[PDB]
Amino acid sequence: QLNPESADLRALAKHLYDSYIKSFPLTKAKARAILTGKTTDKSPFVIYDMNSLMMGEDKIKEVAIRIFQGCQFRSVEAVQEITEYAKSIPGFVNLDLNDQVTLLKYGVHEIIYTMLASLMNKDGVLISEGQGFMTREFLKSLRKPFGDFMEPKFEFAVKFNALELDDSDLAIFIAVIILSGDRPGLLNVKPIEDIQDNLLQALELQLKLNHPESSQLFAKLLQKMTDLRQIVTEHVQLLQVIKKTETDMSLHPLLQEIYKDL
Amino acid sequence: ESADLRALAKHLYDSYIKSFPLTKAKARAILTGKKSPFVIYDMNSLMMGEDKIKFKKEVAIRIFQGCQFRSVEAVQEITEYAKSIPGFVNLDLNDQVTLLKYGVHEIIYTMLASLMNKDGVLISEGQGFMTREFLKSLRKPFGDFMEPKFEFAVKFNALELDDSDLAIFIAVIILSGDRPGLLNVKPIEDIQDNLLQALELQLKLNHPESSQLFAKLLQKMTDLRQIVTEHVQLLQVIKKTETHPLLQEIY
Numbered sequence: 001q002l003n004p005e006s007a008d009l010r011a012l013a014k015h016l017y018d019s020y021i022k023s024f025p026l027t028k029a030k031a032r033a034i035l036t037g038k039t040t041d042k043s044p045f046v047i048y049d050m051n052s053l054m055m056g057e058d059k060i061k062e063v064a065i066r067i068f069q070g071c072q073f074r075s076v077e078a079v080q081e082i083t084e085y086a087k088s089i090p091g092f093v094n095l096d097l098n099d100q101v102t103l104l105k106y107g108v109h110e111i112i113y114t115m116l117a118s119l120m121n122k123d124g125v126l127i128s129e130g131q132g133f134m135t136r137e138f139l140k141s142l143r144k145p146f147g148d149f150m151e152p153k154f155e156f157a158v159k160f161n162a163l164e165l166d167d168s169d170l171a172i173f174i175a176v177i178i179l180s181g182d183r184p185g186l187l188n189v190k191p192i193e194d195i196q197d198n199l200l201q202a203l204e205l206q207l208k209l210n211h212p213e214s215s216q217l218f219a220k221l222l223q224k225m226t227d228l229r230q231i232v233t234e235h236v237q238l239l240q241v242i243k244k245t246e247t248d249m250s251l252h253p254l255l256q257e258i259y260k261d262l
Numbered sequence: 263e264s265a266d267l268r269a270l271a272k273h274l275y276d277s278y279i280k281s282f283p284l285t286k287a288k289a290r291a292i293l294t295g296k297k298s299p300f301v302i303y304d305m306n307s308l309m310m311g312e313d314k315i316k317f318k319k320e321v322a323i324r325i326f327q328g329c330q331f332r333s334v335e336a337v338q339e340i341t342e343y344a345k346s347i348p349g350f351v352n353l354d355l356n357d358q359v360t361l362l363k364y365g366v367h368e369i370i371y372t373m374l375a376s377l378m379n380k381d382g383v384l385i386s387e388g389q390g391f392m393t394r395e396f397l398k399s400l401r402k403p404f405g406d407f408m409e410p411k412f413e414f415a416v417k418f419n420a421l422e423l424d425d426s427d428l429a430i431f432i433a434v435i436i437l438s439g440d441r442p443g444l445l446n447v448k449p450i451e452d453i454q455d456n457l458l459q460a461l462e463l464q465l466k467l468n469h470p471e472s473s474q475l476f477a478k479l480l481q482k483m484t485d486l487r488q489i490v491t492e493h494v495q496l497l498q499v500i501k502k503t504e505t506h507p508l509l510q511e512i513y
């Protein structure tokens with residue numbers, strides 16, 4: 001049943017889950033509760049058009065660019081949360097400082113899209129800490145350059161969410177993503193792969209115990225990692241179109257460094 | 263199932279051995295040193311190997327075209343192999359075509375790695391060895407079409423997989439249920455599910471040593487698809503060169 005090796009893996013899964021809850025205010029469990037059905041101030045105000053958007057700004061704490069800026073800041077914040085979480089991953093802070101930067105530089109967006117799926121269903125996405133919900137249709141109808149940014153995330157989210165992972169699963173998966181080893185520019189790949197192998201072992205057991213009847217969930221989840229890369233690249237090219245189409249459009253420095261020479 | 267997975271593994275290996283002329287074991291012997299292949303390291307050596315070895319104006323272009331000739335050949339070998347995978351033939355015909363159309367490229371690079379090392383690649387069934395430098399020394403954008411494969415190969419070969427491993431991995435690549443246009447994704451995923459179990463057992467029995475090799479191999483699929491997207495890119499750019507009708511059709 002349980003053994004010395006298996007026991008260390010469960011301890012790691014728990015540590016990671018506990019750190020995950022402490023680092024990310026809006027978990028998938030909370031997201032799903034708001035999306036499925038409640039009464040408490042859990043019910044989100046829905047934005048599906050210009051007027052409703054107008055209304056949401058009064059109920060929630062051109063539009064194309066206003067949505068852009070809001071989504072832009074939330075990513076900066078997400079980077080901060082992910083960065084905080086990364087430090088809790090055993091051995092991560094002990095690695096060469098440059099590699100810590102490299103790992104974050106490349107894992108941050110893959111993680112952002114992974115967790116964003118937790119806030120999405122086929123019809124829309126929770127915003128402003130769960131207070132609002134912006135429909136998929138509204139986002140897809142935005143001015144040419146802007147109405148093409150979210151669909152690819154929704155397409156991914158609908159399929160990824162089909163795996164039915166919960167937060168304890170995601171906590172370990174997110175750690176695996178960060179501690180890659182095949183990221184461009186890494187100095188000491190060995191120590192990084194040793195940590196990842198251990199996280200992989202933890203994720204494998206975690207999925208088997210939490211999802212007994214889900215055959216090869218582990219392999220299916222790992223394959224999803226390719227969907228994430230695709231999302232990142234595609235997103236980058238779309239970002240380049242924006243930089244040129246809206247010379248009056250900014251872009252937070254933090255995000256700008258992540259994308260530099262990516 | 264313990265035994266049902268090994269039967270599947272053995273079956274794929276046997277079929278893979280029969281569908282693919284040059285195996286990794288075969289190529290490895292030839293690559294490290296175990297008939298010394300003709301080496302193409304520069305222009306004159308190529309020219310010599312052409313009439314001396316006999317393969318099948320402007321070198322960069324002819325080399326690029328030879329890559330296509332071999333790719334098309336490989337496709338038939340892969341198609342035949344795909345047909346030996348249990349369940350494949352019973353799938354909707356259009357899906358089979360969809361799965362092959364999107365999978366051959368991934369498989370081509372996977373297998374191409376078996377014939378590469380950090381210094382070059384084995385050509386024309388091991389008879390030759392085109393050097394990595396000669397390839398990188400090609401002009402226009404041609405001196406950069408093989409390099410990404412080498413970099414992928416270098417990383418992929420580090421897993422030290424053997425033919426029996428690759429046989430199952432290649433079947434997994436073919437039965438990808440996320441290919442665009444599929445009409446009945448279920449059977450495809452049910453087969454890949456069965457193949458993934460077989461691949462997992464195979465890697466644990468064949469390499470007790472390397473921890474999480476199964477997971478590491480699957481992560482390599484991220485790399486593969488990038489090599490492909492990237493390859494499709496260069497191919498379109500190449501579509502901007504002046505320097506048949508029936509051949510252009512075949513390819």
Ligand SMILES: COc1ccc2c(c1)c(CC(=O)O)c(C)n2C(=O)c1ccc(Cl)cc1
Pocket residue numbers: 066067069070071074116125126127128129134
């Ligand atoms: C998945 O990408 C998005 C897209 C739109 C977003 C957000 C995130 C967040 C943040 C979040 O969801 O956590 C908010 C608040 N969005 C807004 O709709 C918005 C609307 C008007 C203004 Cl002025 C500013 C922001």
Ligand SMILES: COc1ccc2c(c1)c(CC(=O)O)c(C)n2C(=O)c1ccc(Cl)cc1
Pocket residue numbers: 064067068071072075076112113116139142145146147149150153239242255
């Ligand atoms: C959670 O995933 C996303 C999705 C879209 C994003 C971003 C992050 C970031 C932040 C980043 O990429 O670091 C920017 C700047 N996005 C946009 O360009 C954008 C354009 C138009 C609209 Cl309507 C909404 C968003």
Ligand SMILES: COc1ccc2c(c1)c(CC(=O)O)c(C)n2C(=O)c1ccc(Cl)cc1
Pocket residue numbers: 284324325326327328329332333336369370371373374377383384385386387388
């Ligand atoms: C699985 O599909 C392929 C695709 C391309 C290939 C090969 C196999 C092999 C392996 C083989 O042919 O045995 C080689 C050597 N490829 C070349 O890059 C190449 C380049 C220039 C010329 Cl002129 C000829 C071949």
